[PDB]
């Protein structure tokens, strides 16, 4: 060995310096809402504190809600919050809550767990207790995002199929779907709205025919979901199709055919009675 090393030599130089030196010598609502914020972070069941149940009656409700930290909530707490906000009117407030809290959670955990929790499924049904805030708050924003996947589409569309929808609200949702630019998940929602078999306003029917006829010149290959949506449209609403629209649909089938589904659509279109 020729060199001492770092630590031992550091101790040696400090020791030598020391020996040389010694020889030289000779308000209050915030606390409540924070506490119920920790309560809602671990909630499983039972009754909520009454401070949580008077949130929709407040004026500065948003600041209280950010204090309650909704992104850290549990699923049962969010289901009960959905029930509370659906109970106390003010459709704009419910719409903004669904925009801000509910749909971000659904999009977060469907992307993570690949399936929806039980409590959140009942939460979207209870949010559907007020349908106008649902359509403007979750459905149309999810379709306008453009990033909606197939699994989100199937889950939310199944929630739509479970419940009975007002005809005006369903028709408005269908028209906003129809005028929208195409996405693969969009035809699923459109089909599940057509499966409700309500009376259909005629401007919505014209928009649907125009949308499917806007698919006339597209070179993009279509999935089988689009064909099944068109098949549902023809199967349920062949009675109120004009002959011009009928021949246009036949032309669309000629330009965009399917080996299996297209002959069935031709059979239903060729056996249709008007008015």
């Amino acid at each position: 060995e020729e060199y001492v090393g770092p630590r031992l030599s550091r101790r040696i130089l400090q020791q030598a310096r020391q020996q040389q030196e010694e020889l030289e010598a000779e308000p209050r609502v915030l606390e409540v809402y924070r506490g119920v914020r920790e309560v809602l972070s671990k909630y499983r069941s039972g009754k909520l504190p009454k401070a949580f149940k008077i949130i929709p009656a407040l004026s500065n409700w948003e600041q209280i809600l950010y204090v309650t930290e909704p992104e850290a909530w549990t699923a049962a707490a969010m289901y009960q919050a959905t029930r509370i906000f659906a109970s106390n009117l003010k459709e704009r407030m419910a719409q903004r809550f669904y925009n801000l809290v509910l749909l971000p959670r659904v999009r977060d955990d469907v992307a993570e767990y690949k399936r929806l929790n039980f409590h959140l499924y009942m939460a979207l049904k209870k949010a559907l207790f007020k349908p106008g805030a649902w359509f403007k708050g979750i459905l149309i924003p999810l379709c306008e995002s453009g990033t909606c996947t197939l699994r989100e589409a199937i889950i939310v569309g199944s929630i739509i199929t479970k419940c009975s929808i007002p005809v005006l609200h369903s028709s408005a949702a269908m028209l906003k779907i129809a005028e929208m630019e195409y996405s693969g998940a969009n035809s699923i929602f459109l089909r599940l709205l057509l499966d409700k078999k309500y009376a259909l306003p005629y401007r919505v029917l014209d928009a649907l025919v125009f949308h499917f006829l806007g698919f006339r010149t597209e070179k993009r290959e279509l999935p089988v979901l689009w064909h099944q949506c068109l098949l549902t449209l023809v199967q349920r609403y062949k009675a109120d199709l004009a002959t011009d629209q009928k021949e246009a649909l036949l032309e669309l089938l000629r330009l965009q055919p399917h080996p299996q589904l297209s002959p069935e659509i031709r059979r239903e279109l060729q056996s249709a009675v008007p008015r």
């Binding site: 409540v32 008077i54 359509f135 408005a172």
Partner: protein, 48 residues
């Protein structure tokens, strides 16, 4: 608005679309003191 239209036979409802696309204290203190009372009431440690 599209081109081809319902042709014939009646309209039952006109439908309202101009609401969808055209869209886009003492009591709290009482609730607070009730909350504090219940939070003290989970273990009271005094009653005999």
């Amino acid at each position: 608005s599209s081109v081809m239209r319902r042709n014939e036979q009646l309209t039952l409802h006109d439908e309202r679309f101009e609401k969808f696309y055209e869209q886009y204290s003492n009591r709290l203190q009482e609730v607070l003191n009730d909350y504090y009372k219940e939070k003290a009431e989970n273990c009271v440690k005094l009653n005999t």
